[PDB]
Design a protein around this ligand. Structure first.
Ligand SMILES: COc1ccccc1-n1c(CSc2ncnc3[nH]cnc23)nc2cccc(Cl)c2c1=O
Length: 822
């Protein structure tokens, strides 16, 4: 069984476990043993959960950020059902009460023994919440559908649980010996080396003398640094760049001066370098795994005596307000001087005080750490700032996690992408963040699902494959059952790749209808029917992809030839008619980030009572330039509608009326009014979202509209002004908002109000977007690489301004967009 499980993990994670063994690396070995123990202990806990707690683990509630309604309810075993009129304000318990009373009459004769499953989904309705607080009920109310629910007894829930079981003394100047290298170039070679603590240099950079490009180079020289050995902070990073000159970058490499057990490194090291794009302090501190091909630098660290970093107890032994809302040297001195008062009276200003301490002085670090150990916990917002690479110290990192422990699962989910990216800044394998993420993941299966996919989707990236593979292994140790569920998803993804490759080849030699039929024959093979059917959606575990609907599957006969894959489920009814788009060829990371930021905007708006009728469709990278996008049914591109085809319900005398005609055709009579409203609200949301994020090149073929009237965007390729992008008002959109009238200032200005409201709400959470984007710099997205990218967001949110000035500014941009509008 252990052999089987080991082979299943290897397959699932995309790395053979033997590859970890082969490294013969103590840090790896220790990570694996400790984290396996941690995760297996979490699994033990989980298997004795009460039935309500089990639901909370496996089916966490989907909640929104008087009035009558019809609900259909059945019991688990029978096809018979009852349709009830209840209120939007009624609790699930009241509904379960009517259900059980109805069963007792028909069956000839305790609500608390049950939970309500959404038919054909892994989603449950339970808890003390009015029906309209549940995302599912909320959803039905807007679309018009009747909720379909299933009474599931506690014994059935426990059955699911059960089936799913498993020093201060060293004053000499720091120095190294640069021995030799082995590289490839055209000129002379130089080695630059700097000592870093996060972004900050701990002293000046020091260089080699110029040696000819032939080699196989040899230096054999001591490089001495302007910093005493006792002063080196715990997280000291030593960074190298090898380059050529008559500037031609060649390679770089970083390492920690202390190992994972706090011991100062000695003596010789061989540094397998990473190829270059000079110094890259934020780069990984682990060597290039391609030892066959990588240029290599051998260095020597001298035997200073074995010395370890001092223990905490030994460390513990050893105009203010006007600025405190970049600073001058004298301002820095004041902050440091008043550090006790910072702690006592401005605990939320911790980050500012950290950035003024001299991390290149051990006495000063000791004094900072003493305060930190008594520092009150900070809000979540503040803790996210502390995760930035600017705060490399391990005690600071540990403090950050401690303040982040109060994250709700929903908040954690919202920030998961960024917390995963921050792993790329970690100096060691065993760290507080990994342990935090693993514990949260093991306590909430939705968190576990997305953590898995965020890690799995980067396994083709050498710099993270080891770290991410190890985390995924540990996760599997803590849920054997979820491993098998994830393997089923991976198998479907493997088949989709093979199917897409086939389509790419076939469409080059034949017509689309011919390739489409061939696609269908391929899918109808037993191996494909089996692999593609009956899985949890990678885009949403709550969504069940039962039988694949081959007849309705197709592909886009352009660009990367993405696949359109439809599903149906008898048990889910209408809500089981769902699709996924599989794309191979494009890197989906920036799309996912853009969509997640838009979904965050939607949450913040809803928290202030503004529902802009957004369409946060799923987007998930799964592999190398591979991922999935959630199908939005009953939608079309604006461009297709504007084709203004004849013999259609939307056929228009003037092209400007095509879109309104289409919306009329989908929403006859009194329904037109609501559709125009959904269009106006969503238009405002996306107009504000794309403006703030700096997303240009919006055109008719990358905007879609739903039959409800809701607009949404696709094919984000560019953001943060990498194409200062203007606010955008399209005339055809204004025309719909104005109900087809040439002048309708009443409607148009309501729309302006929505835009301004949306914008002012985002400004109030501006620091959240800035902290999240800062963390995202870890991802290495080329459009999010430097300060100039972050500065775009600062300028778009106008955070240096009063709300009055910002709104004035926004108004000028909005007014400029309206004029531009024909
Ligand atoms: C209705 O879908 C379309 C309408 C007009 C033009 C293109 C599409 N469309 C689109 C438009 S993008 C889209 N379409 C539907 N739901 C979505 N969710 C996120 N993006 C979308 N995408 C495809 C992806 C794979 C295979 C196909 Cl066959 C398509 C596809 O037809």
């Amino acid at each position: 069984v252990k052999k089987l499980i080991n082979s299943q993990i290897s397959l699932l994670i995309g790395k053979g476990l033997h590859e970890f063994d082969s490294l013969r690396d103590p840090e790896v070995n220790d990570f694996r043993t400790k984290m396996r123990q941690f995760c297996e202990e979490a699994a033990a806990h989980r298997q004795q959960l009460g039935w309500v707690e089990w639901l909370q683990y496996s089916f966490p509630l989907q909640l929104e950020p008087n009035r009558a309604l019809l609900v259909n309810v059945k019991f688990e075993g029978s096809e018979e059902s009852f349709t009830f009129q209840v209120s939007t304000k009624d609790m699930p318990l009241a509904l379960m009460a009517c259900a059980l009373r109805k069963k007792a009459t028909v069956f000839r004769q305790q609500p608390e023994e049950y939970a309500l499953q959404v038919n054909g989904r892994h989603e449950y309705l339970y808890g003390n919440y009015p029906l309209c607080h549940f995302q599912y009920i909320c959803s039905c109310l807007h679309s018009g559908l009747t909720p379909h629910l299933t009474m599931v007894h506690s014994s059935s829930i426990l059955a699911m649980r059960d089936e799913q079981s498993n020093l201060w003394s060293l004053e000499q100047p720091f120095s190294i010996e640069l021995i030799e290298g082995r590289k490839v170039n055209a000129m002379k070679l130089v080695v630059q080396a700097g000592l870093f603590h996060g972004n900050e240099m701990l002293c000046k950079t020091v260089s080699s003398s110029e040696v000819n490009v032939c080699s196989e180079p040899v230096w054999k020289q001591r490089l001495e640094f302007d910093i005493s050995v006792c002063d080196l902070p715990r997280m000291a990073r030593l960074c190298f760049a090898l380059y050529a000159v008559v500037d031609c970058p060649i390679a770089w490499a970083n390492l920690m001066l202390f190992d994972y057990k706090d011991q100062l490194k000695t003596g010789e090291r061989c540094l397998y370098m990473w190829p270059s794009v000079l110094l890259n302090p934020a780069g990984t501190v682990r060597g290039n795994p391609n030892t066959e091909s990588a240029a290599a630098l051998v260095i020597y660290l001298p035997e200073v005596a074995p010395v370890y970093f001092p223990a905490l107890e030994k460390i513990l032994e050893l105009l203010r307000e006007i600025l405190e809302r970049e600073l001058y040297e004298h301002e820095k001195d004041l902050v440091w001087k008043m550090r006790h008062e910072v702690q006592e009276h401005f605990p939320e200003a911790l980050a500012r005080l950290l950035l003024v301490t001299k991390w290149n002085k051990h006495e000063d670090v000791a004094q900072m750490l003493y305060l930190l150990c008594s520092w009150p916990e900070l809000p979540v917002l503040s803790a996210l700032e502390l995760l930035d690479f600017s705060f490399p110290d391990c005690y600071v990192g540990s403090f950050a996690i401690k303040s982040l422990r109060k994250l709700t699962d929903d908040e954690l989910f919202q920030y998961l992408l960024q917390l995963v990216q921050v792993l790329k800044y970690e100096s060691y394998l065993d760290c507080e963040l990994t342990k935090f993420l693993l514990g949260r993941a093991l306590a909430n299966r939705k968190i576990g699902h997305f953590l898995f996919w965020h890690l799995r989707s980067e396994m083709h990236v050498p710099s993270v494959a080891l770290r991410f593979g190890l985390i995924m292994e540990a996760y599997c140790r803590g849920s054997t059952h979820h491993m098998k569920v994830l393997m089923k998803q991976g198998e479907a993804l493997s088949k989709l790749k093979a199917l897409n490759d086939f389509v790419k080849v076939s469409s080059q030699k034949t017509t689309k209808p011919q390739t489409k039929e061939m696609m269908h024959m391929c899918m109808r093979q037993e191996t494909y029917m089996e692999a593609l059917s009956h899985l949890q959606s990678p885009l949403d575990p709550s969504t069940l992809l039962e039988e694949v609907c081959v007849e309705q599957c197709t592909f886009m006969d352009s660009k990367m030839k993405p696949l359109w894959i439809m599903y149906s489920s008898e048990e889910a009814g209408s809500a089981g008619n769902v699709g996924i788009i599989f794309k191979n060829g494009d890197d989906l990371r920036q799309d996912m980030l853009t969509l997640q930021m838009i979904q965050l905007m939607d949450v913040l708006w809803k928290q202030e009572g503004l529902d802009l009728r957004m369409t946060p469709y799923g987007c998930l990278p799964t592999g190398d330039r591979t991922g999935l996008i959630e199908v939005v049914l009953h939608s079309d591109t604006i461009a297709n509608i504007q084709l203004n085809k004849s013999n259609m319900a939307a056929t228009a005398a003037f092209n400007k009326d095509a879109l309104l005609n289409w919306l009329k055709s989908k929403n006859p009579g009194e329904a037109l009014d609501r559709a125009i409203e959904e269009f106006t609200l969503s238009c405002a949301g996306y107009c504000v979202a794309t403006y703030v994020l700096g997303i240009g090149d919006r055109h008719s073929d990358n905007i879609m509209i739903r039959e409800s009237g809701q607009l949404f965007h696709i094919d984000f390729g560019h953001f943060l002004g990498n194409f200062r992008v203007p606010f955008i008002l399209t005339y055809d959109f204004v025309h719909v908002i104005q109900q087809g009238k040439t002048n309708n200032s009443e409607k148009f200005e309501r729309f302006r109000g929505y835009c301004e409201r949306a914008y002012t709400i985002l400004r109030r959470h501006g620091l959240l977007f800035l902290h999240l984007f800062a963390l995202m710099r870890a991802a290495g997205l080329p459009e999010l690489s430097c300060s100039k990218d972050i500065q775009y967001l600062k300028d778009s949110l106008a955070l240096g301004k009063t709300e009055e000035e910002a709104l004035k500014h926004f108004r000028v941009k909005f007014n400029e967009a309206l004029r531009e509008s024909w």
